[PDB]
Amino acid sequence: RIRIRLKAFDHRLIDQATAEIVETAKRTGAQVRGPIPLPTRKERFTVLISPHVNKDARDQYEIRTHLRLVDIVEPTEKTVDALMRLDLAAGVDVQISL
């Protein structure tokens, strides 16, 4: 079984990422079961402001980076034949992963 990753950041990018691929990575051959979530992963920051006796601040900074699961389990040529005809959504990969 092949499981796909969709490395994006925000709704403004992940929204079309999980749908532009399901429409193109499943034309006839692939068994894409629709957009599967793979819930996002989050990391947090502990940031101080001005280096002084004041450890008070400890600002917070979080990163909500999400991934999707188009999951092309079928190595169909036409499903990946149209993979190179689009260039929007700059940083995203079709990771052919088990």
Partner: protein
Amino acid sequence: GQKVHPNGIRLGIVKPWNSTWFANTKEFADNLDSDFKVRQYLTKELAKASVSRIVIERPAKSIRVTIHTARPGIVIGKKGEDVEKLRKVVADIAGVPAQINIAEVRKPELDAKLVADSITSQLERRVMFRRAMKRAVQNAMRLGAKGIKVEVSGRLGGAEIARTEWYREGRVPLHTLRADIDYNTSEAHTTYGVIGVKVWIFKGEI
């Protein structure tokens, strides 16, 4: 200090970016360092460009960094040299076969950095701090920016007095989240200490 920067706290709205791209852990850090090398050596060398912003996008191993600039004819260089030579600069200072992009800034009165550049350009012009200060205020008002409170950093006059310039004009609802206030500052290394300026253009809504 209780005045958080309004742009980043509103970055969750259409507030733009200047380095948005993707990486794994094995190459966040170096790519971030590559981003600063292009971030710094494109500002000191580009004082006269009146740059609004330089934005880094990294699609795949060949990046599409765009530059927000005031005068379209001046940023071309000697007709494409800076397009190529700075791409030569970035081709190794970032380590990727990058592609440079240049973005215009229509009505540079509408950019908080560029106006703060304009005042700072004339702060060192050896002028007095009040008349020149208010003169620019209405210029934007004649061209929009429906609200700006204008601030100038400390060290005014020959004396120990280092004060602030509050000088509100219009509507700058900082605590209101739906404010999309245009903010950037500017500073000037004066013959006596540090003199800076802070300006908050209000660009309507949404």
